[PDB]
Amino acid sequence: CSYTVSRPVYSELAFQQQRERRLPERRTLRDSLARSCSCSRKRAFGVVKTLLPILDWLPKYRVKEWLLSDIISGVSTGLVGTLQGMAYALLAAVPVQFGLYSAFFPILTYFVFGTSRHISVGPFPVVSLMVGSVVLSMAPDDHFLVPSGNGSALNSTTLDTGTRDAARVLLASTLTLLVGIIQLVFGGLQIGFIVRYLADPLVGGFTTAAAFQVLVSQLKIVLNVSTKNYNGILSIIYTLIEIFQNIGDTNIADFIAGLLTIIVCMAVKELNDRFKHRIPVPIPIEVIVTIIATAISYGANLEKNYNAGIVKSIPSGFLPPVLPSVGLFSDMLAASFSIAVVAYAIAVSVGKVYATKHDYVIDGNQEFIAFGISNVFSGFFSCFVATTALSRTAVQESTGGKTQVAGLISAVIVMVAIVALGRLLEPLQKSVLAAVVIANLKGMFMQVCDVPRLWKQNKTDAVIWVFTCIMSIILGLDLGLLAGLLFALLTVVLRVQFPSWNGLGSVPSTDIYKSITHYKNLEEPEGVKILRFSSPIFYGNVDGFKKCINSTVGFDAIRVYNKRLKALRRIQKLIKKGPKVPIHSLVLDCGAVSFLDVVGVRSLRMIVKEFQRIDVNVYFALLQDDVLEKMEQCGFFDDNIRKDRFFLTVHDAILHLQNQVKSRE
Amino acid sequence: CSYTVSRPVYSELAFQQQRERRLPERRTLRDSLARSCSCSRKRAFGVVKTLLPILDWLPKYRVKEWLLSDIISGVSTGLVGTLQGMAYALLAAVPVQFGLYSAFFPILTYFVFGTSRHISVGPFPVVSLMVGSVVLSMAPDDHFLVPSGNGSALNSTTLDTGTRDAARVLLASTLTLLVGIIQLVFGGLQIGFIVRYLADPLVGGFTTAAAFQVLVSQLKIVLNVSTKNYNGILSIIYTLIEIFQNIGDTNIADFIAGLLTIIVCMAVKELNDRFKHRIPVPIPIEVIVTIIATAISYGANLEKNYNAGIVKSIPSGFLPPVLPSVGLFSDMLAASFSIAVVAYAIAVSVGKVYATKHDYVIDGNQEFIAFGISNVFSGFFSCFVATTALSRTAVQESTGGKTQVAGLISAVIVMVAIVALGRLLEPLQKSVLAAVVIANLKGMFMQVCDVPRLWKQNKTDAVIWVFTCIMSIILGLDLGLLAGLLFALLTVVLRVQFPSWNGLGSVPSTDIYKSITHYKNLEEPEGVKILRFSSPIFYGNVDGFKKCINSTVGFDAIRVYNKRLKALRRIQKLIKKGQPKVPIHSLVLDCGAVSFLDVVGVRSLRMIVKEFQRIDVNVYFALLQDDVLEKMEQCGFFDDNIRKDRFFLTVHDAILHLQNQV
């Protein structure tokens, strides 16, 4: 149809006279906390169902085919998870059995408190890398060597193989307990807005840098070299230079085997990902490559005849729960917070992906509480921080997963691989385990291809991606996230400090106002200069507003007034002996403002007062209701600054100006 | 007065098909790099005028209330400057001989370069300990430690003199020169936007604990309490509890002397404020309480007979300029960066606190080079850093003062006190001059009255004021402003993340759309609702914008889709076996107050459109004026079905679009 209206000019006062405002509701803090405190059995049952979602999806099971689906998904996910755990155990500097421990107990703890259906709780390469880094920083290698072995010249201060692993495991357990406590605190206190600051480019750059560091560490492990656990500033660059300098002390057989298995795994993964229409079930390349590696390494004595690197330290059993060593929280609080927030971000991302893929809901605070309880239970049984790997979750989702029972069955695989099975993997080379991690880095390595796409998009988002990726390499990985979130907040502040001000004008015989820098055939008011200023004025962009006004009016309210004062005294001395030509008004279209920051309303009133002395009216166009109600309490409407200065719409101000010019010459 | 604005409804594609755009100027620097100042002499004369802020106020002052007002004010702040030079020099581990030079030379170069009134350039208490910290670290206390003097058992390892303090002054002079060139090189690239981040409650909440810091720093000297030096965390608390713990060895004669003077000085001060219409020129009680204190001390021997504490160490005569050591600038460079930042922070914080009572807003670029070259001119003469004390800037502004000439005449008082008036203020009890700063300190102690005032105006800045106050007490004045600077910026990102979102509704027989939570007797279109987030959709408020929709529409687009397919599969098996949706048709997001968008916002906003599209409920938008519109189409928002037709220029066009469609 059409758009035509006719109404009087309600600027500020002609609107609030015949409009009865809605009185605010009574606070009544006592009755508010009393009424909010629920006591009926309905709320109790609701909070019990929410806190314990196990009683929700259990009674409505579909056992008929879900039994077979869950058993096959469980055996597959159990194999994949025990392989990923025995691989990531090297990233946390812990023995190979504690990876299987952290692949068994967290699943059982998440089965009774989780809210997802496809999330495979277990180890994670980035989290394991951060745990290993903080363990090396808190317990380096040169702090355990004991002089023994009747050395030639000095005391034989060889490696501390033995009690060193116990100290590392205790440190990892304390770290896991602290991370679980932090997650439970963040969950119970309903403080979940802290993880919203992890932007998509920020987390992308962080994952890219973490994958690069994981590649460096796994290359160090494959080459079988001995570094000095460089940590701190430029740790990755220093250890990479050391690797490049320590090439001579490598193992040719281990390097050849690692390169071969890397090529094979990458080729098989690419073939399975590309030609999916011919093979429905993904081929477990990890399982078959581990089997063939154990078979080849058992035929010939690869440990003695080839001097390879194997585990051969699997006791094939459990251990009683050990009390955590409390007291190391003050020196690892920041590291635990970083690990917890990155693990929660990755878990929420994986959950949202595999939930929008399967069309079900996943609660954030419930996942936080579940991961907290899982890490707390893991800290009592010598396990590290658990998360959900994108590669491990993909297997359970591709093989067909409906409920967490497949995860419970996935624990049975690790269960039988801990009690009796497990000692058969004795001659397995450590390079094979250190290779699948590199093969799983293809997902995060291909994330760099977004920079050419983000650069064509909003450039400020691309700068955050490059800055987060680079800064998370210089000053380590744990402190790199803190340097990324602060940089993102500073970039947000810069976008609200430097707005996009224009010369908004009206199309001929219209009422909508568009910018003048993007159109040609626009008419401007005779004398009046319209201005729009987004990014609401606060204490940091008030000088920007001053400069924008001075640029859009052509002059300055200070210099013109000083010139007028200088010309006035020349008149009073001449009688004793014997600029602002085009500018008529200023309509500020501050319609994109949210807050006002009274520190800035002071300068706004100062501007209004200064422009009044030079006989230049400064009006407003589209101020919001809440903004005006806030400015009223900030001392802005004095006996001279009435409400007639403000307006409701932009066209009403121009109409009032035209009417005043026509009725008053 | 009505007006006819009859115009067909214009969407985005319906407005660009008949109009024309303007070719955006890329403005490449390959040929436009010489457009600032090529040959025009007008731009060259402008930067020289701003470089020398002496040709602005000096050829413009009025001598009516200038001569007598600044002279009585200059001697007031000049006396305080002499006492600070005699006290802060001892804290910097250097001999107390150049303290008067730090108040004379920097003022001369700052009198011409620098436009910031009510500021007395000189030493600052918290910046003197930073200079003394790097001296004791990079220079041992005993350089030679000559073991001579025929002691009791072993050789008398007496501390070497003469050459020890000489290297201490040389090291301190090199640091001031290194800070000066670092302060000057910052003005090269013109980083003047850092001062814009200092809000009035930020500088107000900073110069209230510093007023408490300068109070406890002047309380230990007015009571003669030998306390240790404390810096870092809990610095103000540790010094306060030390005075209360070591209050025993307190000079009773000096206590009653300062207590009697602090009362009479503030009583006449408020008396002048009451009788300001009777006496035109304010009576300079500072020089009055000074001459009577030296009289009662010289005539009674308060030092050798009462132990009251006097200066008795006033130097005499200037010294020729000495060249510094350039080869030592490398070691001092690692520590001078921390001192140079905190020096400029306190320097401009005391300039903005007085910008609220007088319209004298200053610029950061000019003050960065003003204090920069002043410390350079302070260099080569074995002077101190070119900071500004909080006590001297209070005694100059409260007791008269019009321009910076009061600092120039104050240096003249220091110039005559070093060459000819050394023996005059010899028996000065160091109490009437150390407590006179507390009288003028009421101008900053009474600044806490804005907390109940700002609380009723805006709750956010009221918390910012009290946060910087309590944080500067614990973390000291060094980290107090730094932590408050990030906290002030944190309130900006929080107010933009959690806005006052409300559903809008039109007024009857009109096209004005306002919030329905603040009005009554409104109406809402049957099946069409309005939502105005009034905040940009960045990576932080992504889920907040989602929670704003599901809480306003009544239902949740996520839970109604899975239950729909669940019921669809439930009724599907019943056909083979044998056989809470709100009537709201669509929603129009009135996201017109958005100023910027990011990649996370345009991706999440696309998911919202695809989410409601599956529930047979359309989603429309509102005015995207110039930037938030072109950024969406650039980030890949329109692929096959989503087009610019769903947007609207005005909010009423969105309601009229859904009206005639049905």
B367/B369 Cα distance (integer angstroms): 6
What is the CB neighbour count within 10 angstroms for residue B587? 22
Nearest to B635 among A457, A497, A598 (CB): A457
- Provide the b/e sequence for A54-73 (b: ≥16 CB within 10 Å): eeebeeeeeeeebeebbebb
Q: Is A50 on the interface with B (CB under 8 A)?
A: no
Polymer length of chain B? 662
Q: Does A500 touch chain B (CB under 8 A)?
A: yes
Pairing of strands B513-515, B528-531: unpaired
Of residues A359, A536, A541, nearest to B562 (C-beta): A359
Q: Which residue has the tokens 């107090």?
A: B480
Determine the distance in angstroms separating the CA of A194 from the nearest CA of chain B, rounded to an integer.
9
Q: Give B538→chain A minimum CA distance, Å.
A: 8
**Concatenated DSSP letters of A546-589:** HHHHHHHHSS-HHHHHHHHHHHHHHHHHHHHH---SS--EEEE-
Q: Is A297 helix (H, G, I), strand (E, B) or coil?
A: helix
Helical packing angle, A598-613 and A625-633, nearest 10°: 80
Put simply, whether B505 touches A (Cβ < 8 Å) is: no
B239 vs B228: CA distance, rounded Å: 8
The burial of A488, by beta-carbon neighbours within 10 Å (0-12 exposed, 13-18 middle, 19 or more buried), is given as buried
Task: Identify the residue among B12, B363, B500 best suited for mutation to test binding to A, counting A beta carbons within 10 A and taking the highest.
Answer: B500
Three-state SS annotation for B540-577: CCHHHHHHHHHHHCCCCCCHHHHHHHHHHHHHHHHHHH
| C-alpha of A665 from chain center | 61
Q: Is the Cβ–Cβ distance between B179 and B338 less than 8 Å?
A: no
State the helix-helix crossing angle for B364-378 and B163-186, rounded to 10 degrees: 160
Nearest to B80 by CA among B311, B389, B339: B389
Q: Shortest Cα distance from A582 to chain B (angstroms)?
A: 24
Residues listed for chain A: 665
User: Is B625 close to A517, i.e. CB distance below 8 A?
Assistant: no
What is the resolution of the experimental data for this entry, in Å?
3.8
Q: What tokens does B327 get?
A: 């080869």
CA distances from A351 to A190, A337, A338, A658, B633 (A): 19, 21, 20, 59, 29
In contact, A262 and A439? CB cutoff 8 Å: yes
Q: Say if CB A389 and CB A120 are below 8 A apart.
A: yes
Bridge-partner residues for A514, per DSSP? Answer: A505
3-state secondary structure of A140: coil
Asked if B457's CB is within 8 angstroms of A634's CB, the reply is yes
Distance (Å, whole) CA A354 – CA A361: 10
What was the elucidation method? cryo-EM
Instruction: Point out the residue among B8, B517, B535 whose CB comes nearest to the CB of A594.
Output: B535
A45 touches chain B (CB under 8 A): no
Residue for token pair 């029972």: A405
Please give the interface size between A and B, counted as residue pairs whose CB atoms are below 8 Å apart.
238
Tracing tokens 């680079």 back to the chain, one arrives at A470
Rg (CA), chain A: 34
Hey, is B473 helix, strand or coil? helix
Measured CA to CA, the distance from residue A158 to residue A150 in angstroms comes to 10
